[PDB]
Design a protein around this ligand. Structure first.
Ligand SMILES: CC[C@@H](NC(=O)c1cnn2cc(C)cnc12)c1ccc(OC(F)(F)F)cc1
Ligand SMILES: CC[C@@H](NC(=O)c1cnn2cc(C)cnc12)c1ccc(OC(F)(F)F)cc1
Ligand SMILES: [Mg+2]
Ligand SMILES: [Mg+2]
Ligand SMILES: [Mg+2]
Ligand SMILES: [Zn+2]
Ligand SMILES: [Zn+2]
Lengths: 340, 319
């Protein structure tokens, strides 16, 4: 309502007016103030021509975007600024890798909307913690798997069914179902478990080459692209990867604290007393992040700089590892911690 | 003068931690120990003079983190424990044991929280130890403070010579020089008729007093390390500001505590208490407690790696 008037009266702006480096892989979406993000979303959709392509009612689109933004909570990492930055990287893939030569317009459109919606109502805890804590989400989704991802999707649907927020209510019956299916598949691809299951399929597709006439390749690419966006904080500079590490480990240790308080022993990366950040970071870089961008590189030669930045950032984590060794007294001037 | 048992039932025991005794009761405790060893009656020490001397000594210490009155007091208390537990009268003359106790009180007088190397950056070594002794002489030459003012000319000079020697023995370099001679003495067995054996033993006893914090439990050794590193790094900070490269162990950004604690424990502290055990079977529990503390230090060495986020929540220190 208040933010609605602000957003609407701003008007859909050319992507250049935001920043000259906006469509570049070097640009950091987190540099943009949060109060400008909703306009940037609209700008990106305009630049990809999805507004005119699908004749989306602009006030409906404004309301949708504000609702999505409002649909995020404020944990250290999984907040709107994460969804925004993920969305931005999806836009970057479109502009830089020329996705129109690989996927249907409806698929790219679904990828971008999914990115906006992919962590809706995230509470800063993983799928595991929902079960352990016996949350409502576990009650709802634990037997199906990908607990959080199913909630994110359910939240996205609820937004669409909010009056004045249905950006697809003018879509053909065929296109409408397609969009819903695509959003579900893409959002569920954000579960690491899913990525790990389809990993060998992705390796096959990258080696043999992407075949645009292969409907399975479309599915797999959409998944790979979604995971690339989700992890894109690893493709920027040192400052970004380091700041993000702060937010992610903050979130992780908060969850770990809650697991100790209810009896459970949290995994190493959730435990603030046992977690060695350099080691956990490097292991994640080398074994999760880097292969995703290696696969992307093999499918799109223009993605090579992304893999190189993740590799460079991983080397930087090795370089600064030694600093986690307490020299002198701790920044406390006490040794009381030697009796834990 | 309060009897020793009235201070604490465990006051004469090796398990007693003299740092647990309130600083306001320490002067009084000094007089009690001297009373219990019977040096007051033995040497006809004037009590008011002794009272004033003790307060001048107490006042003669500055307030660095480690080298303050409480260090001197705890050192002096350990000398009393050696007397009470090992029966030093089998090895040493009464005047030598008396000199040792007074030397313990005086051995770090006017310490500034800096080492001999700080004085370098007058070059025959042991600069601070020499200063500590001069300060002891200056206190004795203070009106109403000379506890030996009634001694014979021979006994006076004897007492001063002993104090100088014992105080000079607190320098690590001195200890390392005489170490072979200490080992030989322990090897052949103590000879009471051997003047050189008396001199060497006094040096050993003093160093064992000086390092006595390592002979208690974990709490003491951990707390003392804090105080010592606090002191060492403040000197490092000062040397950096004045425009000099401090030694690695004085630099809070270079120094690794576990590697330094253990090296000190096993290479310096433990061989001293081993030699003490060799000469005094009853000192066996002391070496064991040092070895145990040395073992505990290796146990907690892993904690000097940052797990989770640092004190705050920022990885700002990485950039
Ligand atoms: C918070 C979940 C998120 N993790 C990160 O972004 C992350 C960054 N540094 N980091 C370091 C550690 C130790 C662990 N996680 C991270 C994530 C999201 C999707 C996903 O699945 C996909 F890989 F397929 F995308 C895998 C992980
Ligand atoms: C401050 C000097 C004092 N050191 C300690 O008490 C001490 C305790 N922990 N610690 C850890 C390190 C790394 C270094 N020093 C210490 C000392 C005094 C006399 C002496 O000479 C003697 F060995 F002969 F006694 C040698 C050292
Ligand atoms: Mg997610
Ligand atoms: Mg190939
Ligand atoms: Mg000294
Ligand atoms: Zn995400
Ligand atoms: Zn001392």
């Amino acid at each position: 309502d208040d933010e609605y008037t602000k957003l609407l009266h701003d008007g859909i702006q050319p992507v250049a007016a935001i920043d000259s480096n906006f469509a570049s892989f070097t640009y950091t979406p987190r540099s943009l103030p949060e109060d400008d993000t909703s306009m940037a979303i609209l700008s990106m959709l305009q630049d990809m021509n999805f507004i005119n392509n699908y004749k989306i009612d602009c006030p409906t689109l404004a309301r949708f975007c504000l609702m999505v933004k409002k649909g995020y909570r404020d944990p250290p990492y999984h907040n709107w600024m994460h969804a925004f930055s993920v969305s931005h990287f999806c836009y970057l893939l479109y502009k830089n890798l020329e996705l129109t030569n690989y996927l249907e317009d409806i698929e790219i459109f679904a990828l971008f909307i999914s990115c906006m919606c992919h962590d809706l109502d995230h509470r800063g805890t993983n799928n595991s913690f929902q079960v352990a804590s016996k949350s409502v989400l576990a009650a709802l989704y634990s037997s199906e798997g990908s607990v959080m991802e199913r909630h994110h999707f359910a939240q996205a649907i609820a937004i669409l069914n909010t009056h004045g927020c249905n950006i697809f209510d003018h879509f053909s019956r065929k296109d409408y179902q397609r969009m819903l299916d695509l959003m579900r598949d893409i959002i569920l691809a954000t579960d690491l478990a899913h990525h790990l299951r389809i990993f060998k399929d992705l390796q096959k597709m990258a080696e043999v080459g992407y075949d645009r006439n292969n409907k399975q390749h479309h599915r797999l690419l959409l998944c790979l692209l979604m995971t690339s966006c989700d992890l894109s904080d690893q493709t920027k500079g040192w400052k970004t990867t380091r700041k993000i590490a702060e937010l992610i480990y903050k979130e992780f240790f908060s969850q770990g604290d809650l697991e100790k308080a209810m009896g459970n022993r949290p995994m190493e990366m959730m435990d603030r007393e046992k977690a060695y950040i350099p080691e956990l970071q490097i292991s994640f870089m080398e074994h999760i992040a880097m292969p995703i961008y290696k696969l992307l590189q093999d499918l799109f030669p223009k993605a090579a700089e992304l893999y190189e930045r993740v590799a460079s950032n991983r080397e930087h984590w090795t370089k600064v590892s030694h600093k986690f060794t307490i020299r002198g007294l701790p920044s406390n001037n006490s040794l009381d911690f030697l009796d834990e």
